[PDB]
Amino acid sequence: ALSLTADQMVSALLDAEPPILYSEYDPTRPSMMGLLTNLADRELVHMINWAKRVPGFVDLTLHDQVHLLESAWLEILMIGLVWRSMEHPGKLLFAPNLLLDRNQGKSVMVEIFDMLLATSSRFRMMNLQGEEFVCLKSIILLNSGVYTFLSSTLKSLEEKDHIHRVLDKITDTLIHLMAKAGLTLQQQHQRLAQLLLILSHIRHMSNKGMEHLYSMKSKNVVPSYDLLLEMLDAHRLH
Amino acid sequence: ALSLTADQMVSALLDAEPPILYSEYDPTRPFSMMGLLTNLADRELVHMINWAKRVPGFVDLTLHDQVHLLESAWLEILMIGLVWRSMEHPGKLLFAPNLLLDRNQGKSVEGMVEIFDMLLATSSRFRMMNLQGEEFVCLKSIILLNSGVYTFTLKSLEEKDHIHRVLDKITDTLIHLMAKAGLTLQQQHQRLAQLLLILSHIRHMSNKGMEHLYSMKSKNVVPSYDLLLEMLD
Ligand SMILES: C[C@@H]1CCCN1CCOc1ccc([C@@H]2c3ccc(O)cc3CC[C@@H]2c2ccccc2)cc1
Ligand SMILES: C[C@@H]1CCCN1CCOc1ccc([C@@H]2c3ccc(O)cc3CC[C@@H]2c2ccccc2)cc1
């Protein structure tokens, strides 16, 4: 678990990658938020499966797993989107059959389209690599909720220590990747820093986004603890 | 500014540090929490502008871009300051030397104890990491340069490039500090990452806080571009 080598970490993360889903609409017919919501809902099921395959995540309590996903899920959809969109300047590839520019975001939203587009830009600028992307996405999963375990039972302390050890392992892994690519030591820590500072912006976008979903006043429109629990709380019967 | 050594960067940042202000209230009268905190934050902001102008590379930017960066960062910068001076007061927030509050005192306005709890947890994280003063001023400068840089023409391309060069320099500086402290190369990279990942939480806290002040519907409870412009210009 914490015994994995760097290439073992990378391979594990790459293997765990969720699928790219399609928007569900009649391509033979002439709804924006509805399309985006349906897509996100289906992605979330796959995100749970992905999380359970991030090395060290299942070692956590069921409760702490839920807490981490409750905190990170929109950031994770967003970094997924920004990655998919990297090779489509000016557009967001929500799905292979749903490629939108900023003008199409005006039907509701263009404020958060603009933020997403700029992140995609920034990724393009840095020439972000696939192996770097999956590290970052796992870092979001582990880090986003780790400061909000309002708890300090012995168990909670052990949980927080474990999470920071897994995070250290991914740091080592990112550095390894950049060493593997020929970067100098200075280039390595500079790029590590550049990559991690983008995570703050992704946090920001998730907050502006959560702000919309909460403004809708829809009873299901933000995944409840209980929904996330139902989805993570698997049996071993299959 | 891009020609500073790591030690010169650290000296510059340490010298740039704003003063610790006091809360303004009559200490002889019986103990408005929001009013006290707002008055304190208002006065800190003026000193923040002076500090920002002293961060190496900041005044090299256009005045427009200076304003944009402060507009994005100002609440994060107040928050990291608070968390830092609270570090050695477990369970409390040292808003000012004469205003040390625990979470119970945060319950006076609705929606405030949640923000208190987050601030306290960050302070705890700082305590656990044994955060050093030199690291703190690096981090605060990083917030200033980074928070607005993804939400901005050839001039703008040049501005963004400059900002990222200054950020790289502060990264170099943090690593140099950890080197001086004798950490291994592995430990250096791990601690760099741990420090930077806390900045995501501080952003989160700023967003929750901005949400409070916007909810107040007070005419100028969020500092305007033009007020920031006036103080910077
Ligand atoms: C999907 C969630 C899970 C349970 C309830 N359901 C609420 C729907 O929340 C969303 C999440 C993301 C989006 C949009 C989106 C969809 C898929 C994806 O891969 C990325 C994103 C990025 C955010 C985007 C969005 C979010 C808020 C407001 C406008 C657009 C829209 C609605
Ligand atoms: C600060 C700005 C300047 C122009 C308008 N004015 C609005 C008042 O804004 C604030 C900012 C921070 C606070 C609280 C604060 C005070 C001093 C400081 O050094 C640290 C902080 C941390 C945030 C805190 C707060 C913020 C929002 C809601 C509750 C508590 C309160 C009001």
Numbering used by the authors:
A (entry chain B): 307 to 336, 341 to 418, 421 to 550
B (entry chain A): 307 to 337, 341 to 461, 465 to 545
Provide text from the study:
The pro-oncogenic cellular activities of estrogen receptor alpha (ERα) drive breast cancer pathogenesis. Ligand-dependent transcriptional activities depend on the association of coactivator proteins with ERα to form functional complexes. SERMs and SERDs elicit a structural rearrangement of the ERα LBD to sterically preclude binding of coactivators in the activating function-2 cleft. Activating somatic mutations near ERα helix 12, Y537S and D538G, enable hormone therapy resistance in metastatic ER +breast cancers.
We also solved structures with the WT LBD for those molecules with no existing structures (LA-Deg, LA-Stab, RU39411) or were able to solve to improved resolution (RAL). LA-5 possesses a 2 S methylpyrrolidine and showed a SERM-like profile with an IC50 of 15.68+0.27 nM and a normalized fluorescence of 1.706 ± 0.09 at 5 μM. LA3-2 and LA5-2 are subsequently referred to as LA-Deg and LA-Stab for Laso degrader and stabilizer respectively. We discovered that addition of a 3R-methyl group on Laso’s pyrrolidine induced both ERα SUMOylation and degrading activities, while addition of a 2S-methyl on the pyrrolidine leads to an accumulation of ERα in the breast cancer cells. LA-Deg induces SUMOylation but to a lesser maximum than fulvestrant and GDC0927 in WT and is further reduced in Y537S, while LA-Stab did not induce SUMOylation with either receptor. Despite their unique influences on WT ERα cellular stability, the methylated Laso derivatives showed identical transcriptional antagonistic efficacies in the WT and mutant cell lines compared to unmodified Laso in our assay. Overall, these structures present canonical ERα LBD homodimers with 2–4 monomers in the asymmetric unit.
